[model samples]
Target: ILPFQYVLCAATSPAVKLHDETLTYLNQGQSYEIRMLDNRKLGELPELNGKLVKSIFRVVFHDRRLQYTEHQQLEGPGDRILDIDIPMSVGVIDPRANPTQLNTVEFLWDPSKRTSVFIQVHCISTEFGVPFRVQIDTFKENGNGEYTEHLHSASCQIKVFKPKGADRKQKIDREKMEKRTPHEKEKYQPSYETTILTECSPWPEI
Candidate 1:
């Protein structure tokens, strides 16, 4: 009876599975991904378990059933299709060679004092479509054993588009995203830095 913020407990966004993808509109390796969080346990977020959150990253990744072959074309068999995307996509920078990588990180042994952690993400690819699935999870351990739980999960279609004077729509969106009133011990917020590609190099064909 530890309430909704139960001990050895966790929670995440999008509440349930979000099917399919969308025209969120983004570029690879050039744009930035972000994960901004509001701390819990210390009694702001839902769960106040000593230190439930394990790792943090700007962009964490993996490949999916959508695979590539000897000729390098991503293909999925019709019989082997599913809407679930696992955290399936892309790579990160500045600390190469891993099962994963990212930046501005720390071990949240007890991130109670910190209110916000915003990470800027940069991918290392040019792959498009297939609707990348994004997921976040948390883990905990007790004297008896370890516990793991699902937080938030979703699939999104990221992309690039033709040149059109679409700047006004984004400009209006920018102001709207920040036009809120007063703080109310809010929750975690994540988004993509889509205005410009700040750190893309090596793939200079564009």
Candidate 2:
């Protein structure tokens, strides 16, 4: 099981993609990497002094509208090694917090470490404008000799869309000028005063 203090994020290529607050953006047709860091100290929790523990990390989409470009069938052998999913047992020791890994998403996740995976977006997700979710549940071996889930904590939002080439401020200059101009100076309307008072006139002449 991972500690509450952890880093979970999505990245584009070698860099962690840009995000505003919790709204993370991913481009369609491009493969985005998923990184998870279990930042915890050994023997931090005495709940289970001696037990075999593991975590079930999930990058689940809230909508079924999305599909994958690569799968066990679509990606055969060789390049499949470059696929979008990874096992939970693998992760890097003393992982870096940058979320930048070179070319591979498969890393060591033994106890306290970082793990990652990449997802190839096959469908466009801008229509719903909804975000997917990520969660990690820790399992510890109990007296029953079973690795049972003890705690579940899900925290993260991922929004996917086709990358835009034009910025809102970079729209047509003529359109900006048109919007900046007023339609006309129209006539004023009458308005009410206090609740206990009578109707009031807006014009100074009244």
Candidate 3:
């Protein structure tokens, strides 16, 4: 029941760059918080519910997977949520790149090296109706100064939901999930994902 706009641009270009060690070695599980706002204003996004969306990001190095570590809902004029550590494949190009040259560079959460990567996020609605997609991609340069590890494309989409009034169920299906032990509940709670690393670091070594 809310009307608002969504900004479709990168807060920071070319996202986070993985360390050589992270690129060649281990699982770099990290989280980040992203704000969803209108390109015209800095206020909260619309709080429309009952919607689903898919977000995609381009790739840089050809990493096997980029794990989505966390996602968080944010208060705004429009419905907003952060994407967790999502996995993407290398060599995949974005569906909407101009001239389509391998441009940006990004990484999977894992601390390993390879080539291109991409990200896709799906947002399902529960309250209002508003859905859209976000996509991102990254590329790598070779010793020849030519783009080597490049993604063809990356993309995502969103779907709005309709309110079913009395048809709506009163409770969510908790039974589908096994009851977590107290320890499990306490120790295994999902954490917030924030873009702290990307915001604080320098650009990748090109």
What TM-score do all the candidates reach, one by one?
0.34, 0.41, 0.22
Give each model's whole-structure lDDT: 0.27, 0.36, 0.25
Candidate 3 local lDDT, 102-139, one digit each (tens): 22223322112222223222233333233232334223
Candidate 2 Cα outliers beyond 4 Å, as residue runs: 1-6, 9-21, 29-31, 46-54, 57-84, 87-108, 119-123, 143-146, 163-206
> How many clashing pairs per prediction, in order?
3, 7, 65
Estimate, for each residue in 15-83, the C-alpha lDDT of model 1 and write its tens digit: 112331222433332222333233234445345345444332222222343422211231111221112
Model 1 global lDDT (CA atoms, 0 to 1): 0.27
Q: Which prediction has more favorable TM-score, 2 or 3?
A: 2
Give me the candidate number with maximum TM-score.
2
Model 3: which ten-residue window has the lowest total lDDT?
A: 20-29
Measured by lDDT, the strongest candidate is 2
TM-score of 3: 0.22
Candidates in descending TM-score order = 2, 1, 3
Model 3 stretches astray by more than 4 angstroms: 1-80, 86-128, 144-150, 160-206
Candidate closer to the true structure by TM-score (higher is better), 1 or 3 = 1
Question: How many pairs of residues in model 2 come into backbone collision?
Answer: 7
Please give the lDDT score at residue 139 for candidate 1. Answer: 34
